[PDB]
Amino acid sequence: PSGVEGAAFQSRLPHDRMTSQEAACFPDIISGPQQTQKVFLFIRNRTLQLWLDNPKIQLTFEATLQQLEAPYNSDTVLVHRVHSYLERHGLINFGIYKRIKPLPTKKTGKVIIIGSGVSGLAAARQLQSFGMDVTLLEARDRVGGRVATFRKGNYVADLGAMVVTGLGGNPMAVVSKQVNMELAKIKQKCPLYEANGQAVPKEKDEMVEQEFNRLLEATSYLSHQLDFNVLNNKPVSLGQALEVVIQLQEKHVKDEQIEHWKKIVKTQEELKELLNKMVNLKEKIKELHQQYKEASEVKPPRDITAEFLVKSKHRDLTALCKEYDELAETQGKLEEKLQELEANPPSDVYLSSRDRQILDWHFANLEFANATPLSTLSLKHWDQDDDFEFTGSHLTVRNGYSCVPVALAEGLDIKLNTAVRQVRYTASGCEVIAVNTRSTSQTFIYKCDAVLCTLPLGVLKQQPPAVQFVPPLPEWKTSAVQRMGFGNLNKVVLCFDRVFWDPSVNLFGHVGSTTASRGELFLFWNLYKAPILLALVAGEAAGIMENISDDVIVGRCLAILKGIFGSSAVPQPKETVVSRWRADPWARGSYSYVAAGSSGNDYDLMAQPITPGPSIPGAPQPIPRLFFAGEHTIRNYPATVHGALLSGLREAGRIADQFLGAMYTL
């Protein structure tokens, strides 16, 4: 899309309708006459386009109104309201921009942000952008959180997020322009090598993937068209449903062989009755011939009865011969028909063990995408964020994904090595109690007007709690935390002294031996300039490889590499790293998934902020004081770096609106 309308698409907004957010801030216009709505919609799209076309510089209200044309640059309070709206919710002037007018020296309000992960940083920068006192508390000795990059020498490999899913309306595209990221496309071709070490033949490789893709659609049919969503009270999981579809395809393969062979018996046995006539008729003909011969033996001249007898027997024998010839006619059709049916038997098996093992790799990939075993994923909802897909090739970051957070952390008050241990929020303010991660006895107290919590969902789910909330989080929020899924997928970094793989191939698979080990080192990435290979560990195997030393793991990697490229070809790696995301106590997981029994609605429940009870009974309802952000709170774009960043922008606008006031709604 292009024009002013490309700005609306690139900003995740319908170019020709007012959104519900926009209606909330501009009720007069949405409820007014169709002409006004179009004016507004243009002013919105046009401002977005301006910010987009150059995102390294602030878009001031002046700059904007300058470059509108009448009739649009006529009403200047409509322009001012629109520019303020966009700036507030991070649709313009977000990320890293030169400010034209430097920030006012005196700040209003005070906000503690827990975590300098990408979502934390994105709010922190916005809030400070809005003139607030913002301090981030980070347990780690580095920012970024789950956006980790490992650097040593010229080796550079990401242990966390490493892919940008398309620039088509992605906030990261604007960020990439703001902070140089070597963004290189990911070529889609992935060859699959089996346990022996031989590449799967292309004909088989295509045949399975279609079956795979064919199976996934069937579940979606079980879900939406047969409402197969509950079994014995427990809700059905994607894994369950895939089995009920593989079983029903193996059932069908059998029903198909039965009613085929059952056509052979129903014809073999027409033949049985036909041969019984034919052998009992060759017996009547044997006898009649004898009678006709004996009757013909009588020497003429004979009486007319003895002469009738010869003729009558001759006719009768001829009539029987007609019969027996018509029956070996019919015997010929059936003889061929049985050969036809035997010649075209139906498929022997639905899937071979080799075929099934290859399929099991396609399920590993799907347990990679969702960072969880397929049994856990909700059948109805696992793919509910599939409508909001960006458009474009997926990319990687050659310089490491760590630059984006570091870029964002510029100018922010970040207290590293500071584990928040208690959040305490009351009708009049909040205090956050943290310790120092190195000597934990040394205690810190932070007072503030509002606390924004970007704790990973896995941290939020820890029992007994890593962080205590005083007063305790209400049951609707905690229940949401139990229901939601937080999964895990780990990575292994392999640093060699020479490229010994196909350099024009970004990623190549390895097929497992079992279903149970389908995730164990199932996929490798060439993505960087240097000779670095990344091996994933997903599925049920991720949780289990965390109990196994790095040497045993790098061992299993070398062996797999040796099979695909030859024992002589792969040398020992110079530097090796393994990730343990579930073990890490600052994550306790990888990213969230829609677990069975959860829905997308839970992702909205996490985002809702918490409001404390009045200190004095009978006092007026207090302002909300605890706000949440992060990858587990944005329902439309969960488990992604862009989603985390969007969640941070969203809370900053809402927090600012609550404490600085929204003057753009009149």
Next chain:
Amino acid sequence: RKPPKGMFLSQEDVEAVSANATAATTVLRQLDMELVSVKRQIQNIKQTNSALKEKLDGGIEPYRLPEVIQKCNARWTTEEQLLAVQAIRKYGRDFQAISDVIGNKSVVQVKNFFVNYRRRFNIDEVLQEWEAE
């Protein structure tokens, strides 16, 4: 609105493979037995019918008989009249057989022959006797 072509899914089918734990595995075992059942039933009629095939070895070539290519005449030699009556006694109204016996009389000639000689050869009487068998 419809399943992927070639993928078989039936509500009926689905309940039956979910109704308990091992129900899917149980259902396939019968089909595995229903299959072996019908499969050796084949080798057993394939066996029965291979014996009957052997019994026909030679067909009926030795019992066959050559063709009387004989020009179909019009006059009724007293010989042929008598073959007629005896044919009517053994064959009732099957003129094709009656004509086949006599050898040189067409079916119509036989057909109208009954009316002409019917009084003369008591052929009602003969026919009822043919009805008695």
